[PDB]
Design a binder for this molecule. Structure first.
Ligand SMILES: [Mg+2]
Ligand SMILES: [Mg+2]
Ligand SMILES: [Mg+2]
Ligand SMILES: [Mg+2]
Ligand SMILES: [Mg+2]
Ligand SMILES: [Mg+2]
Ligand SMILES: [Mg+2]
Ligand SMILES: [Mg+2]
Ligand SMILES: [Mg+2]
Ligand SMILES: [Mg+2]
Ligand SMILES: [Mg+2]
Ligand SMILES: [Mg+2]
Lengths: 129, 70, 88, 224, 170, 74
RNA sequence: CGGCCCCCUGGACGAAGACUGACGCUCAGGUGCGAAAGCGUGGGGAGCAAACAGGAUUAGAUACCCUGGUAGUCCACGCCGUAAACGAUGUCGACUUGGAGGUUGUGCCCUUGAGGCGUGGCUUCCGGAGCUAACGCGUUAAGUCGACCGCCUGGGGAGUAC
RNA sequence: AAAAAGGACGGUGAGCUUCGUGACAAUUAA
């Protein structure tokens, strides 16, 4: 069964990028919208939208630069079988700071830099490079 | 395969008609299969083998119509 | 394999109306009815393992729904088990 | 300057049977009629025009254009087009390595040029029969295939290809050396190696003449 | 410029063709073995010259001629189209037989032999059954005399499922 | 005469969308059993798998009732 | 698992909907099923056929071949729980261009037919990207991932000894 | 009562063993 919607999101992004898809459809959720909202400020995706009320659908517009996938790599860090929690001093650097780590802190979900500026740790959701 | 010779029918052509009727009925082939005994397992392989062979005939009955030889 | 009349009857006394065919109490009662019916069949034909696999499948399914029930609305469960001929 | 009407008459919109299509040709496929694909001309026309411009720009700077077509339906057509614009063409079998092994095929070109000269002067007197007939056949082969490239001299500046799938070998060598490729890509063709994709029919004498005429006009214009 | 959808809708109406339908080709070039014909399709067709030639084998077609040939494919032939004209001639034979059936037109053939219930007759390569007692008005006892002679015939029944043309002179 | 039984290999049964062939019916069935009483393979007769199973089932029932012979040998 | 028929009975799939409202996935130990051979008891016995006997072949022939032939193969009721028990690929879910065939549902359209356009289930063969040591696999993955379990760490000794 | 794309032809072998030990690999570039 489907037990980690976040990993499903990563596969949906990675497969659509590798397949040169213009857009990808998936079941929606607050956390998925929050991650997609975070993705907008760094330019990894073009735009996101939410349709439906009983069964919300999250729609992401993929991005390509020279016919090549914008998302080079994305991989899950904290997983249902193994939760990963990091203190603020130990926060990882994804793609030598060029990429971002989605961190769920006490003040909500933010990037590793946002957590570092705010001095907060949390759960490492994913690596994006 | 019961053949009855008609009037003004030469004997040789009646025999020739008899050869075909037995052949289309596969009498000779059937007896050959049943002369000795075959093992469940082996046969299955032979059948699948012949089936793959006929599938290749289909895949050769087309697509091969291209390229040159001389 | 239950007859149409038997399915229609069982829904009536266990459901609110004729269209409440999906409630957990109806599912357990429908399963229990078939377990009892197949018991006379399964005492004889002892080697009918293929049909016996089906019986254990409904038994397992009945176990999860009854366990699911007891978690919520405990009361409803006790009324169901007393009304039906099941020890547990 | 070619208009949508003229291309429609020539059958450019016609593709191949659905049994042979390549899914990478989906963006340029308008639809399928009677299990035959139809190329979306509304996308070809703007993009075809942009290619024609660049070809004029290349011809403006003394660029060398190499027309590639091997179908017997279009072999003579490509030949005539190149002759008109004093370009180069390969109507006979494409010999592997003209581009990657250019420094070796030059020797065969050199042999061809001497054979063209020394046979007109020499054979007339020193016939002997046998050797004369032998070298004559030799000449045939070479020219029939390499005749259009005897005076080409060096690496080309651009490739024009009909049926990118059939001449995939030529496109590979051009990609290796970084020479731009302009190819007519049908529904069964692979556009991955083509730098300037022209989705159109590659099997019709009518359509091929249209394409060749268009390209020939633009290059002469730049030259002048 | 007009939309592609409307343009292609136009093109198909002046063409009126389909694998089951008939096409109006234009002769392009006449070669020793094949003839190049354009029917508005995606590729020229090199149709063998004998298909255009009449039953006697004389070239009745010249460059630019319009020919009501039959369509075979569009790109089955290595990506090229094939065209048929002997099938169109075969269609001509079948339709004139149909006219002989309905409009009482005459179709000429040859009696090839005698069978249990009548005669086997030849109609331009087709097999026909001619009832023995319905051959002619006069009740001639010895009806064999008409075998092997060219005769007119009228179609009584046409069976495509057996290529059997039941005919009689009556 | 003009005996000619060209078979273009189509489904006679399909025409009429027979919901279930009938064993009782004999004439129809006979047109599909060889002289040696064997069942003709669908490769030669072209019938669909669905109707052949109905056909095979029906002929075997007819065979039991002795309406057609099992074999010509007797 | 393959003649036909009856009685009892399991599962799968599809159409239009309604109902319940996460009730789910996996599973150590545990339990059940589990080809053939074999074992126990009671039947049955044609054909075939371990063992065995004779005749051949060979230097020998405890074999291949020939003529015979017992257990067994069959039935009833128990036991054994092993197989190259193989797709040598554990189960479940999502995602990632296509083509042909087979089988089985179902919707619509001058039903116009020996038609056309869809939409489900299962299955076979070509193969793209990708993956792979390679062979190859390739929407039924051996591709990209997630959940859980079993299991491997040089050959032999040894799947053996206690 | 035909047109190859061929449906398939069964015709068949008696027996004819084993090659001592270690060593032909020998090299590489600036
Ligand atoms: Mg266990
Ligand atoms: Mg046993
Ligand atoms: Mg026993
Ligand atoms: Mg016994
Ligand atoms: Mg002995
Ligand atoms: Mg002994
Ligand atoms: Mg023996
Ligand atoms: Mg084991
Ligand atoms: Mg097995
Ligand atoms: Mg192994
Ligand atoms: Mg493959
Ligand atoms: Mg042991």
């Amino acid at each position: 069964s489907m037990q980690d919607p976040i990993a499903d999101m990563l596969t949906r992004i990675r497969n659509g990028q590798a397949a040169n898809k213009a857009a990808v459809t998936m079941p929606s959720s607050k956390l998925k919208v929050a991650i997609a909202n975070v993705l907008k400020e760094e330019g990894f995706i073009e735009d996101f939208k939410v349709e439906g009320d009983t069964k919300p659908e999250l729609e992401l517009t993929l991005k390509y630069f020279q016919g090549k996938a914008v998302v080079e790599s994305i991989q899950r860090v904290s997983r249902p079988g193994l939760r990963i929690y990091k203190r603020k001093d130990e926060l990882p650097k994804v793609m030598a700071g060029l990429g971002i780590a989605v961190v769920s802190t006490s003040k909500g979900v933010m990037t590793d830099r946002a957590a570092r500026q705010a001095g907060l740790g949390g759960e490492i959701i994913c690596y994006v490079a | 395969p019961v053949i009855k010779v008609r009037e003004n029918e030469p004997f040789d052509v009646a025999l020739r008609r008899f050869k075909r009727s037995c052949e289309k009925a596969g009498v000779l082939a059937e007896v050959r299969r049943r002369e000795f005994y075959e093992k469940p397992t082996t046969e299955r392989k032979r059948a699948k083998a012949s089936a793959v062979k006929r599938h290749a005939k289909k895949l050769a009955r087309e697509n091969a119509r291209r390229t040159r030889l001389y | 394999s239950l007859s149409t009349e038997a399915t229609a009857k069982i829904v009536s006394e266990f459901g609110r109306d004729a269209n409440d065919t999906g409630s957990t109490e109806v599912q357990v009662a429908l399963l229990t009815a078939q377990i009892n019916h197949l018991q006379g069949h399964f005492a004889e034909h002892k080697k009918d393992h293929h049909s016996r696999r089906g019986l254990l499948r409904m038994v397992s399914q009945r176990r999860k729904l009854l366990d699911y029930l007891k978690r919520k609305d405990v009361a409803r469960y006790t009324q169901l088990i007393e009304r039906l001929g099941l020890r547990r | 300057t070619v208009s949508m009407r003229d291309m429609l008459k020539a059958g450019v919109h016609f593709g191949h049977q659905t049994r042979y299509w390549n899914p990478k040709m989906k963006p340029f496929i308008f639809g399928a009629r009677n299990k035959v694909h139809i190329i979306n001309l509304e996308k070809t026309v703007p993009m075809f025009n942009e290619a024609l411009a660049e070809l004029n720009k290349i011809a403006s700077r003394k660029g060398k254009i190499l027309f590639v077509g091997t179908k017997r339906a279009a072999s003579e057509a490509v030949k005539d087009a190149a002759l008109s614009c004093d370009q180069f063409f390969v109507n006979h079998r494409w010999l592997g390595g003209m581009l990657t092994n250019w420094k070796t095929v030059r020797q065969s070109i050199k042999r061809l040029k001497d054979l063209e000269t020394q046979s007109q002067d020499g054979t007339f007197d020193k016939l002997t029969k046998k050797e004369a007939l032998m070298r004559t056949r030799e000449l045939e082969k070479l020219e029939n295939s390499l005749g259009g490239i005897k005076d080409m001299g060096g690496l080309p500046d651009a490739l024009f290809v009909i049926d990118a799938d059939h001449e995939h070998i030529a496109i590979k060598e051009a990609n290796n050396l970084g020479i731009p490729v302009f190819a007519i890509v049908d529904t069964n063709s692979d556009p991955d190696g083509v730098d300037f994709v022209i989705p159109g029919n590659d099997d019709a004498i009518r359509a091929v003449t249209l394409y060749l005429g268009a390209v020939a006009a633009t290059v002469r214009e730049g030259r002048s | 410029t007009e939309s592609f959808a409307q343009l292609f809708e136009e093109s198909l109406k002046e063409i009126e063709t389909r694998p089951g339908s008939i096409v109006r080709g234009v002769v392009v070039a006449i070669d020793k073995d094949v003839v190049l014909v354009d029917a508005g399709l995606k590729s020229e067709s090199a149709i063998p010259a004998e298909q255009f030639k009449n039953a006697q084998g004389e070239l009745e077609i010249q460059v630019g001629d319009e020919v009501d040939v039959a369509l075979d494919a569009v790109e089955d032939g290595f990506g090229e189209t094939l065209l048929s004209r002997e099938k169109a001639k075969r269609h001509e034979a079948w339709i004139t037989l149909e006219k002989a059936y309905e409009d009482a037109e005459t179709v000429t053939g040859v009696i090839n032999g005698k069978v249990k219930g009548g005669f086997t007759v030849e109609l331009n390569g087709i097999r026909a059954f001619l009832p023995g007692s319905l051959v002619d008005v006069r009740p001639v006892r010895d009806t064999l005399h008409l075998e092997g002679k060219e005769l007119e015939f009228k179609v009584i029944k046409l069976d495509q499922k057996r290529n059997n043309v039941v005919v009689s002179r009556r | 005469m003009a005996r000619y039984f060209r078979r273009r290999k189509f489904c006679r049964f399909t025409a009429e969308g027979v919901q279930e062939i009938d064993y009782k019916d004999i004439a129809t069935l006979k047109n599909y059993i060889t002289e040696s009483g064997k069942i003709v393979p669908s490769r030669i007769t072209g019938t669909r798998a669905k109707y052949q199973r109905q056909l095979a089932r029906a002929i075997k029932r007819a065979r039991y009732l002795s309406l057609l012979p099992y074999t010509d040998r007797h």
